[PDB]
């Protein structure tokens, strides 16, 4: 009968309708973010939209530090993002306890994707409503950006976009990557990649940013942290005076 | 509420039969045909595998006949995937019987164990019934040769000649005329081959899509020899039956 | 119906070379074209 | 696992599953039983749709629960032998717990109880079988015949039949059997049971099976060569009178 | 070998070479037959521009 | 049973004897006491000879499964922690005494794990009942910046001291060396100080020396 | 609380065919067109990596995986379902054979054991069937090289040459003439490359083709030397550089 | 297909869960309740509606206390918030049992949000229909978070839910603008009384009753207690003065 579209069951076209509708829930916040991969570090920059003046800007953020070495940026409704953050932190804890060494980004991304797949396969569960971008630097592999989805399809990215204008930023970065033929930014300093990402994001969205519209996460060698507002203002001032 | 998505598998119809086993008995008819003939000297199990092509592997490939014990072999007609679990449980039960009594398990005990397994799902649990029906063949000192059959309903009866699967009625009508009470193994084998030739949906009868299992008792007494006819020996009986 | 298509295509092929009679090798061309179309449209 | 209730009280008061199981029983093979002074006879028929069913390994329609009490069923054959297994294991447990061979009344009560529980427990459809229990209590020669319905109601019957066309056999027993004057011999009981069967079976002497139960741990199964012997004089006495 | 082992991309070339050899031998009818067979095999595949030009 | 391990600049090397002793009596003269967890990590057991192979099989299966899951090489640290947890959860009821050596992209490593769960790390380490004699020798001869041939010679000297000074250690010498640059290679019967000499007389008996109560033949194949 | 979906989600249609099984078959027949063929001295299993976005890394995604150093797996259905299947199959294979018997199970028993999970998924209530179709290739010292195809229904069939995906019909109908009794590993890989050429619709190079071979026991990849009993893993996977050498061999 | 709102975990075609939206709409049919984040601590306030005079005054209370420094004020389905604050108290007790440090406010927020979303993942649980303005004082300072039935919480500088939710937020914005440098608790309690009075104008048909409570370091030194004595009357008649 018509109960196909309600639960995660196959459809006459061979489609999982619930998982398809889950993706449309990731654009509710219409927050555009992108992450580039530097020569030795990674930086992820996301729009920071504060709807009401009653909000405290410090607490509102879609960037969660999973561990001392792995950072994560998540797009979608925040409560499900926080559930995913809790599970990811707990699983990083469990892996560090059981194996004794800090886990690489790909392992965490694969485990969260497997969890989302278990969510999809079990009928009584509903799929996660978020899209998670795992970002970190792996001394065993190198800088890496990993993006999963509600279905569980994860794959490393040279540079990740998201939000309503994900396609436009994707082409904007693809033109640069296809003209420079390099798989990563050649800028050695984490200082330069931040301005590169901000400049490309500004040219893509066509908007000008202030101290509070954007939140930048930086993952250096064995260190992840979120820059404060003064840091973003200084970066924007440097960009404005440079170009 | 987890109710609207329930299908109520174990529900009595207004007139009073189950509906899931009703459609399982239709799924049986859409599977490959199998034939079982009870002869005085032995039992012959043959089946025609469905979906055959030049790229089908035949060197080591048995999908309709399965071995549960050195004396007892079964024929599968239906969904092979669901039949695999039943086969494994039957083998486990037979080995447990050998554990408990240190004597060959009679066919009726295993047939009951499998019928009970099917009935348990047809009764409670709200799960779909197994869409597979078996053909049981074996030997013992109790009743000699035995030839039962199974159903998704979980009922079993003894038969001197059965054929479950596609064109069951045609095969039964063909075999009932030619069935006597005194054939040897070869007469039953040629009768089964003729029945398969006259019931198949293709034109000719090539050795690729036919499987044979026979029970023979010769010089050695008390132990029968179970041989699954390989293609090299399978193509031999085709010329003997005249089909070639 | 493919046989009729083969015959009609052979007749057309004879016209393409501005000839007056249908030949066996034009029949080969027609049957090849008909087979190709039949096996392609099955996709 | 499955906790959903399958038997729900209908707005008219009946349970739909139980009253559907009644019809499921109504499609089963006819089974009849009568009792004499010291003999009880359970007669039954078999399906004649398909042939080439042997007799030796074919499961008997009347299953032996114990040496002194036997059971016959009608309706869905798949579910009935489960009740047979439960009754047998319960009889063995009763022997272990009370040091006494089981009685017909207690076994029938247990069967009615398990059918009632399946009509009560969630996630399980009611049994589609109707059972007849016959036998003799220890040190007692009185034949006891009991009928158990899928609804869980059990009663004693001097002569009861179940299955398809059970109304015809019931009305036949209502006039050719006397409750206050039972037949006095095993032969008379067998003759009455046979003559009752031809009212419905209408040929099929091959697939008419009859079990005769006697006291002092005596249960016999009459073969075909005796059933046709009775049928001979029964049909001889039918048309000439 | 290429008839049974259906290899039209190579059958085109072998038939074209056969037509060339037959033309060199002045047996024009067989050359025409080989060319027509190659044309039959040609217009069913992704034959490259070199072989269609030839 | 004597097992030793020496850590040098490029990699690490361990060694073991071949005599399995169940007490006052010797069971087998040539056995492989070295257990493989992964192609790059090796373990050698001591103490009880009946928990070592089972525990190493468990850890090898789980570690290779984990490496396949992570699509990367195994790490000695993960194996060490897993041995620690497994031995601790039984609460000291397993007397397995194991050595663990391995290399990884992070570098080279060598630890020891005790029966009740205790752990330690050192460049040289000998564990087991016969560990004393060899460990004294390696403490006497060891020095910084060893070479491959020097390391294997030191291991050979330690195992020779252990086999000469202890009853349960002897027969052949089994050595595994781990090289960061190249593949790890395994030496079978690297040293054979004990070789059984020929007997003075041959104890071959004439045919039919012992009477036969009954002759019979048992079938094998169908 | 728990799971209230204890009822089976696969119900027999009145036509006599399983819904979810015939639905997963449709979900399988669309997607990546993979293939695998068996030769005398080895088995080659090939698939094409459809790079979704050109900013992604197809290297991180493993279209083919290693069930055992002898047995590899190729799928043509849904990514995450195949990933979960391969993880579970590796775990249960370890549990069933490495723990109990001490070595790696052969292809025939491993395929039945992994299909056990899928044939339980179509049975256990509250879950949907896996939307993948598995191509299992493996070798053993007794039954030799063997290739098995696993359907979402749980049924597995032994096939000498196979293909599943969008181009399944064309590849299947084209492999009969390609294949014969005697074959070589390089012959088999050339056959696979030629077959996959038309079924690809994007850029053709070494990066967009995922190819693995089961051949002789190569000792270089074994990871240790000194044991004559074992000679290395038979399952090896070509990198982009390895495959873009036979790519122009066409 | 229809019936996308019958169940809970089902996604609508636009990707918005529907039972949560109905829970939100049920929240607004509740008594107004505001909270002010003063410089040193927080100041809660409730507008428990006086029904028929049979109800005993100054006895029924709605500002529930968690531990010592966390306060909970709830609107909407009052019992559902009762159960939510009960679970929150259990979590705080467990944390203090196995960490012996009083639960910090963001940690309590994480716990309550994870509990709330656990009830909007399944098909066998009704989402909570209560919005809370829980807050308090911890070591790092003061925090005031509003929780929503969708499971999303934010670090507000002031919030209010109820019938007069919209009116209350306007006066909250006016108060924030009037005192950008900050606000003292003593004036904050009077401002909260004024805000509640302005919000109650929508429900002037029924009688009102005001209860207020505040947690602070300057006076209450991290202890939560109500307002009793002359202070409550002073706030009441100050707020009635401008009317």
UniProtKB/Swiss-Prot annotation, chain B:
Keywords: Cytoplasm, Isopeptide bond, Nucleus, Proteasome, Ubl conjugation. The keyword Iron does not apply. Pfam families: Proteasome (PF00227), Proteasome_A_N (PF10584). Transmembrane segments: none annotated. CDD domains: proteasome_alpha_type_4. It is found in: Cytoplasm; Nucleus. The keyword Transcription does not apply. Its main location: cytoplasm. Present with 17100 molecules/cell in log phase SD medium. NCBIfam families: PRK03996.1. Belongs to the peptidase T1A family. The proteasome degrades poly-ubiquitinated proteins in the cytoplasm and in the nucleus. It is essential for the regulated turnover of proteins and for the removal of misfolded proteins. The proteasome is a multicatalytic proteinase complex that is characterized by its ability to cleave peptides with Arg, Phe, Tyr, Leu, and Glu adjacent to the leaving group at neutral or slightly basic pH. It has an ATP-dependent proteolytic activity. This is Proteasome subunit alpha type-3. It comes from Saccharomyces cerevisiae (strain ATCC 204508 / S288c).
From Swiss-Prot, chain C:
The gene is RPT6. Belongs to the AAA ATPase family. It comes from Saccharomyces cerevisiae (strain ATCC 204508 / S288c). This is 26S proteasome regulatory subunit 8 homolog. Present with 4700 molecules/cell in log phase SD medium. May form a homodimer or a heterodimer with a related family member. Interacts with OLA1, TMA17, and UBR1. The 26S proteasome is involved in the ATP-dependent degradation of ubiquitinated proteins. The regulatory (or ATPase) complex confers ATP dependency and substrate specificity to the 26S complex. N-acetylated by NAT1. It is found in: Cytoplasm; Nucleus. Transmembrane segments: none annotated.
From Swiss-Prot, chain F:
Its main location: cytoplasm. InterPro entries: Ntn_hydrolases_N, Pept_T1A_subB, Proteasome_bsu_C, Proteasome_bsu_CS, Proteasome_sua/b, Proteasome_suB-type. Keywords: Cytoplasm, Hydrolase, Nucleus, Protease, Proteasome, Threonine protease, Zymogen. Its EC number is 3.4.25.1. It is found in: Cytoplasm; Nucleus. GO terms for molecular function: endopeptidase activity; threonine-type endopeptidase activity. It catalyses: Cleavage of peptide bonds with very broad specificity. The keyword Thylakoid does not apply. One of its GO terms (cellular component) is proteasome core complex, beta-subunit complex. Belongs to the peptidase T1B family. The proteasome degrades poly-ubiquitinated proteins in the cytoplasm and in the nucleus. It is essential for the regulated turnover of proteins and for the removal of misfolded proteins. The proteasome is a multicatalytic proteinase complex that is characterized by its ability to cleave peptides with Arg, Phe, Tyr, Leu, and Glu adjacent to the leaving group at neutral or slightly basic pH. It has an ATP-dependent proteolytic activity. This is Proteasome subunit beta type-2.
From Swiss-Prot, chain H:
Belongs to the peptidase T1A family. This is Probable proteasome subunit alpha type-7. The lineage of its organism: Eukaryota, Fungi, Dikarya, Ascomycota, Saccharomycotina. Its main location: cytoplasm. It is found in: Cytoplasm; Nucleus. GO terms for cellular component: nucleus; proteasome complex; proteasome core complex, alpha-subunit complex; proteasome storage granule. Keywords: Acetylation, Cytoplasm, Nucleus, Proteasome. The chain holds residues 5 to 247 of 288 of the full protein. It comes from Saccharomyces cerevisiae (strain ATCC 204508 / S288c). GO terms for molecular function: mRNA binding. Present with 12000 molecules/cell in log phase SD medium. The 26S proteasome consists of a 20S proteasome core and two 19S regulatory subunits. The 20S proteasome core is composed of 28 subunits that are arranged in four stacked rings, resulting in a barrel-shaped structure. The two end rings are each formed by seven alpha subunits, and the two central rings are each formed by seven beta subunits. The catalytic chamber with the active sites is on the inside of the barrel. Coiled coil: none annotated. One of its GO terms (biological process) is proteasome-mediated ubiquitin-dependent protein catabolic process.
């Amino acid at each position: 009968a018509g109960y196909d579209r309600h639960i995660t069951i196959f459809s006459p076209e061979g489609r999982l309708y619930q998982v398809e509708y889950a993706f449309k829930a990731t654009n509710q916040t219409n927050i555009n973010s992108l992450a580039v991969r530097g020569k030795d570090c990674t930086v992820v920059i996301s729009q920071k939209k504060v709807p009401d003046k009653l909000l405290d800007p410090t607490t509102v953020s879609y960037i969660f530090c999973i561990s001392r070495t792995i950072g994560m940026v998540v797009n979608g409704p925040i409560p499900d993002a926080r559930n995913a953050a809790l599970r990811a932190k707990a699983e990083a804890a469990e892996f560090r306890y059981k194996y004794g060494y800090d886990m690489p980004c790909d392992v965490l991304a694969k485990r969260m994707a497997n969890l989302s797949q278990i969510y999809t396969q079990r009928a009584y569960m509903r799929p996660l409503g978020v899209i998670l971008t795992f970002v970190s630097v792996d001394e065993e592999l190198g800088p890496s950006i990993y993006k999963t989805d509600p279905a569980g399809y994860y794959v490393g990215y040279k540079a990740t976009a998201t939000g309503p204008k994900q396609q436009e930023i994707t082409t904007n970065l693809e033109n640069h990557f296809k003209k420079s033929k390099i798989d990563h930014i050649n800028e050695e300093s984490w200082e330069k990649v931040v301005e590169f990402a901000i400049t490309h994001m500004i040219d893509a969205l066509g908007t000008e940013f202030s101290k509070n519209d954007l939140e930048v996460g930086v993952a250096t060698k064995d260190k992840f942290f979120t820059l404060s507002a003064e840091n973003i203002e200084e970066r924007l001032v440097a960009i404005a005076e440079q170009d | 509420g987890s109710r609207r998505y329930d299908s109520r598998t174990t529900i009595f119809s207004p007139e009073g039969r189950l509906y899931q086993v009703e459609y399982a008995l239709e799924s049986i008819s859409h599977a490959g045909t199998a034939i079982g003939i009870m002869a005085s000297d032995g039992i012959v199990l043959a089946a025609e595998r469905k979906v055959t092509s030049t790229l089908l592997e035949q060197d080591t490939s048995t999908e309709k006949l399965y071995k549960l014990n050195d004396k007892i072999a079964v024929a599968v007609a239906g969904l092979t995937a669901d039949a695999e679990i039943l086969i494994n449980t039957a083998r486990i039960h037979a080995q447990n019987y050998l554990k408990t009594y240190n004597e060959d398990i009679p066919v009726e005990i295993l047939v009951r164990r499998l019928s009970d397994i099917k009935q348990g799902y047809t009764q409670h649990g709200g799960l779909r019934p197994f869409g597979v029906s078996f053909i049981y063949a074996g030997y013992d000192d109790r009743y000699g040769y035995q030839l039962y059959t199974s159903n998704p309903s979980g009922n079993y009866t003894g038969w001197k000649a059965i054929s479950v699967g596609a064109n069951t009625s045609a095969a039964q009508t063909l075999l009932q005329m030619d069935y006597k009470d005194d054939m040897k193994v070869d007469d039953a084998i040629e009768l089964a081959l003729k029945t398969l030739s006259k019931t198949t949906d293709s034109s000719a009868l090539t050795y690729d899509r036919l499987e044979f299992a026979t029970i023979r008792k010769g010089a050695n007494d008390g132990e029968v020899y179970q041989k699954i006819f390989k293609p090299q020996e399978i193509k031999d009986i085709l010329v003997k039956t005249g089909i070639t | 119906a493919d046989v009729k298509g083969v015959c009609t295509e052979a007749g057309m092929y004879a016209l393409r070379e501005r000839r007056i009679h249908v030949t066996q090798e034009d029949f080969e061309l027609a049957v090849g074209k008909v087979m190709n179309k039949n096996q392609e449209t099955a996709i | 696992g499955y906790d959903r209730a399958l038997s729900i009280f209908s707005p008219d008061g009946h349970i739909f599953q139980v009253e559907y199981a009644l019809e499921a029983v109504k499609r089963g093979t006819c089974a009849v039983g009568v009792k004499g002074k010291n003999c009880v006879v359970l007669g039954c028929e078999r399906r004649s749709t398909l042939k080439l069913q042997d007799t030796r390994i074919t499961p008997s329609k009347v299953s032996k629960i114990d040496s002194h009490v036997v059971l016959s069923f009608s309706g869905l054959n798949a579910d009935s032998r489960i009740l047979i297994e439960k009754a047998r294991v319960e009889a063995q447990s009763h022997r272990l717990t009370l040091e006494d061979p089981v009685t017909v009344e207690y076994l029938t009560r247990y069967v009615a109880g398990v059918q009632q529980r399946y009509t009560q427990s969630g996630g399980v459809r009611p049994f589609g079988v109707s059972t007849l229990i016959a036998g003799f209590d220890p040190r007692d020669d009185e034949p006891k015949l009991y009928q158990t319905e899928p609804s869980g109601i059990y009663s004693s019957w001097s002569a009861q039949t179940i299955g398809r066309n059970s109304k015809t056999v019931r009305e036949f027993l209502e006039k050719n059997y006397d409750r206050k004057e039972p037949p006095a011999t095993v032969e008379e009981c067998v003759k009455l049971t046979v003559r009752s069967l031809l009212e419905v079976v209408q040929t099929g002497a091959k697939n008419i099976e009859i079990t005769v139960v006697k006291p002092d741990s005596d249960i016999v199964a009459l073969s075909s060569e005796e059933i046709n012997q009775y049928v001979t004089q029964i049909e001889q006495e039918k048309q000439e009178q | 070998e290429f008839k049974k082992l259906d290899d039209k991309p190579s059958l085109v070339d072998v038939h074209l070479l056969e037509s060339k050899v037959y033309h060199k031998l002045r047996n024009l009818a067989k050359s025409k037959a080989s060319l027509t067979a190659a044309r039959t095999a040609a217009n069913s595949i992704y034959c490259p521009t070199q072989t269609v030009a030839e | 049973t004597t097992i030793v391990g020496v850590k040098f600049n490029n990699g690490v090397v361990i060694a073991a004897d071949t005599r399995s002793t169940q007490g006052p009596i010797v069971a087998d003269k040539n056995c492989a006491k070295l257990h493989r967890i992964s192609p790059k990590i090796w373990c050698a057991g001591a103490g009880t000879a009946a928990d070592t192979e089972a525990v190493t099989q468990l850890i090898g299966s789980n570690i290779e499964l984990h490496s396949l899951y992570t699509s990367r090489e195994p790490r000695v640290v993960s194996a060490l922690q897993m041995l620690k947890q497994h031995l601790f959860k039984y609460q000291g009821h397993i007397g397995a005494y194991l050595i663990v050596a391995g290399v990884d992209p992070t570098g080279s490593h060598l630890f020891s794990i005790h029966a009740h769960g205790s752990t330690d790390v050192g460049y040289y380490l000998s564990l087991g009942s016969g560990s004393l004699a060899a460990m004294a020798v390696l403490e006497s001869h060891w020095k910084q910046d060893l070479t491959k041939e020097e390391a294997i010679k030191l291991a050979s000297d330690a195992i020779q001291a252990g086999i000469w000074n202890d009853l349960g250690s002897g027969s052949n010498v089994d050595v595994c060396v781990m090289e960061i640059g190249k593949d790890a290679e395994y030496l079978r019967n690297y040293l054979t100080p004990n070789v059984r000499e020929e007997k003075q007389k041959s104890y071959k008996f004439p045919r039919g020396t012992t009477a036969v109560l009954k002759e019979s033949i048992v079938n094998i194949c169908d | 609380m728990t799971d209230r979906y204890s009822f089976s989600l696969t119900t027999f249609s009145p036509s006599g065919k399983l819904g979810q099984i015939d639905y997963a078959l449709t979900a399988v027949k669309q997607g990546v067109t993979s293939l695998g063929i068996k030769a005398t001295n080895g088995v080659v299993i090939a698939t094409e990596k459809k790079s979704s976005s050109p900013l992604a890394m197809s290297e991180t995604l493993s279209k083919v995986s290693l069930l055992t150093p002898d047995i590899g797996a190729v799928y043509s259905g849904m990514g995450p379902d195949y990933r979960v299947l391969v993880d579970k199959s590796r775990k249960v294979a370890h549990t069933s054979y490495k723990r109990i018997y001490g070595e790696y199970p052969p292809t025939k028993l491993l395929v039945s054991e992994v299909a056990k999970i899928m044939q339980e998924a179509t049975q256990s209530g509250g879950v949907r069937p896996f939307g993948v179709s598995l191509l299992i290739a493996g070798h053993d010292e007794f039954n030799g090289f063997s290739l098995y195809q696993v359907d979402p229904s749980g049924s597995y069939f032994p096939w000498k040459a196979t293909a599943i995906g969008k181009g399944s019909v064309a590849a299947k109908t084209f492999l009969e003439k390609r294949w014969n009794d005697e074959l070589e590993l390089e012959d088999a890989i050339h056959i696979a490359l030629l077959t996959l050429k038309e079924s690809v619709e994007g850029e053709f190079n070494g990066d967009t083709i995922e190819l693995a071979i089961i051949g002789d026991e190569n000792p270089d990849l074994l990871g240790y030397t000194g044991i004559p009993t074992d000679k290395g893993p038979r399952f090896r996977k070509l990198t982009s550089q390895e495959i873009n050498d036979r790519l122009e061999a066409l | 297909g229809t019936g996308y709102d019958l169940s809970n975990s089902v996604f609508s075609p636009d990707g918005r869960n529907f039972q949560v939206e109905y829970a939100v709409k049920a929240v607004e049919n509740g008594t107004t309740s505001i909270g002010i984040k003063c410089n040193d601590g927080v100041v809660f306030a409730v507008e428990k509606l006086i029904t028929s005079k049979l109800l005993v005054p100054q006895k029924n209370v709605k500002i529930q206390v968690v531990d010592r420094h966390i306060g909970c004020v709830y609107s909407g389905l009052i019992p559902d918030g009762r159960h939510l604050v009960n679970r929150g108290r259990e979590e705080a007790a467990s944390f203090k049992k196995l960490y012996k440090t009083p639960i910090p406010i963001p940690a309590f927020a994480d716990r309550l949000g994870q509990y709330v979303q656990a009830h909007t993942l399944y098909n066998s649980v009704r989402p909570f229909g209560v919005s809370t303005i829980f807050g308090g004082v911890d070591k790092n300072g003061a925090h005031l978070y509003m929780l929503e039935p969708s499971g999303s919480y934010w670090g507000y500088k002031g919030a209010a839910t109820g019938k007069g939710r919209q009116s209350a937020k306007a006066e909250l914005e006016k108060l924030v603008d009037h005192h950008p440098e900050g606000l003292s608790a003593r004036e904050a309690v009077k401002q909260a009384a004024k805000i509640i009075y302005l919000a109650h104008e929508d429900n002037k048909e029924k009688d009102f009753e005001l209860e207020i409570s505040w947690c602070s370091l300057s006076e209450t030194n991290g202890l939560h207690k109500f307002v009793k004595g002359d202070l409550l009357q002073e706030a009441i008649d100050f707020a009635q003065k401008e009317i």
